[PDB]
Amino acid sequence: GSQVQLVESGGGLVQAGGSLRLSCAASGYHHPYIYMGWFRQAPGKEREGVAAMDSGGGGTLYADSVKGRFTISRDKGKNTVYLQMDSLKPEDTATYYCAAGGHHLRDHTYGQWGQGTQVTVSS
Amino acid sequence: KETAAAKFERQHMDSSSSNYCNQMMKSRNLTKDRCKPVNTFVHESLADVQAVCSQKNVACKNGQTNCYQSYSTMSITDCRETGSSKYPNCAYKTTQANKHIIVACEGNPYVPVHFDASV
């Protein structure tokens, strides 16, 4: 009820070259989040934006390393955002986080974060 | 090393006279270096102002999408350079209002870093 929640699902363990989908649905926020996106933090690395998209389904942005492999989408008129991840590579292994209410792929501008979902791409 | 968050407090927060802005624009250092042409002061608690970052997400005037508009109008003061205002003798007109504020928010914890607009 009273608190915003970004419910993350999907993710997990897959072989290198495999595919996974991540999902995020916000509850408790009674307006559109103009941007929502996925960030990740991989072992040994700082957190980085992966993909983001605006509430009309445009303004799509990707990290250079996932373009052509990952696809972000949103439900129009709802605060949900999804990431289809194909052709996965070991260095895509990371904790993935849903983020909402920010600007493009800039992490510091996002104020609502999911708890983080592990994605593990084995080799 | 003045943090972004602290700069917003310094520039925009006065939780506590038609001469108010002359007094305050100098007191918060907005007349050192230049006469900042426009400045807004908010007379609400810091907690009420920080809570706006949890309120209605709206586009910032420059098109950034991490701005937030307050649900209630808030007590503010506008300060605006006068005609005879010329650096280093800055001078301001004070206009009181009760308007919704719009701020840009950043960080963890997520707090205002820019005062964007009143409407």
Side-chain angles (χ1 to χ4, degrees), chain A:
Chain A
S2 72
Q3 306 293 297
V4 185
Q5 306 278 1
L6 301 184
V7 181
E8 294 169 348
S9 53
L13 182 52
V14 68
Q15 291 96 358
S19 290
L20 283 177
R21 185 179 199 249
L22 282 163
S23 172
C24 179
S27 57
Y29 190 70
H30 305 300
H31 324 272
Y33 275 122
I34 294 172
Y35 255 95
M36 299 182 69
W38 289 94
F39 288 75
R40 75 193 170 179
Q41 197 167 1
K45 285 176 167 36
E46 290 176 342
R47 181 174 74 175
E48 79 178 333
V50 180
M53 171 184 267
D54 72 34
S55 45
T60 299
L61 296 165
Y62 292 104
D64 184 77
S65 60
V66 307
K67 51 192 256 249
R69 297 191 300 119
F70 295 5
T71 302
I72 187 174
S73 52
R74 292 183 61 176
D75 291 319
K76 14 157 228 122
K78 219 176 278 130
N79 290 324
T80 59
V81 61
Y82 307 91
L83 186 67
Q84 175 60 41
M85 303 161 94
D86 299 318
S87 299
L88 279 158
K89 293 175 180 181
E91 67 257 37
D92 289 323
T93 296
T95 304
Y96 285 76
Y97 300 91
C98 187
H103 178 76
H104 296 215
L105 288 173
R106 206 173 304 153
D107 61 356
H108 288 328
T109 64
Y110 282 79
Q112 200 57 60
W113 291 82
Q115 329 307 143
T117 295
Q118 181 68 51
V119 172
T120 302
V121 182
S122 62
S123 45

Side-chain angles (χ1 to χ4, degrees), chain B residues 39-72:
Chain B
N39 194 75
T40 298
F41 286 108
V42 195
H43 315 295
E44 301 298 334
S45 63
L46 185 57
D48 282 359
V49 173
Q50 288 167 338
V52 176
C53 296
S54 283
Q55 306 176 15
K56 195 172 262 170
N57 186 209
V58 302
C60 313
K61 291 185 157 176
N62 72 349
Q64 277 174 235
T65 60
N66 62 307
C67 272
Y68 288 88
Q69 179 164 328
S70 55
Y71 294 143
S72 188

